[PDB]
Structure 1
């Protein structure tokens, strides 16, 4: 026997997420009796894309705040500032997320503000 050298399925797929673990997680959880080989690949790819999208937007918010470390605040801001993620996570609570600086136009003081210039 030859016993060719090991290569993981993510690398074969050109991915970073663990395809094998996703497969294991699918097997364990009473989702189906059997699971096809491409399904965990597809799902892992989806999870990877969505993670990249969130991290990208959160880093954008960080730079906006002159911060080098991603914090929950940026994730909440990112989510609520994105129409599609907001829909997806409309009924989701982000711990330590706070809220958006959204003030209704009618509660702010009048154009009689006293400083024309």
Structure 2
């Protein structure tokens, strides 16, 4: 493959063309054009582990968007990154106030 230089496996060719021509830096001079794919592999692996754990539980084997919404709201680093996003095909965090409650 063209990605196994440092444990990566995502496609490189089109990614090499895009990162080299990212239109944001004049030249990536020594230089980590593959670090975008590195963080991409990192996120893919963490999503793999989380989704496997979620699907394997609930006595099922599939990921319902409810589970992914719960996982997205679960993390704190993702909340600090972009905390102004919501997940569709699910529901809001359940809530009842003790003052609302009888």
Larger of the two Rg values belongs to structure = 1
Do the structures match in fold with TM over 0.5?
yes
Q: Which has the higher helix share?
A: 1
- Count the aligned residue pairs: 102
Paired residue for 2:50, among 52, 57, 62?
57
**TM-score, with structure 2 as normaliser:** 0.74
Structure 2 portions without partners, runs of 5+: none
Which residue does 1:43 correspond to in 2?
Answer: 36
| Alignment root-mean-square deviation, CA | 2.5
Aligned counterparts of 1:107 and 1:63: Cα–Cα separation in 2: 37
Structure 1 portions without partners, runs of 5+: 1-6, 111-117
Where 2:86 maps in the other structure, the secondary structure is strand
Deviation at 1:29, TM superposition (A): 4.3
Which residue does 2:11 correspond to in 1?
Answer: 18
Q: Which has the higher strand share?
A: 1
**TM-score, with structure 1 as normaliser:** 0.66
Contact 1:73-1:98 within 8 A present in 2 as well: yes
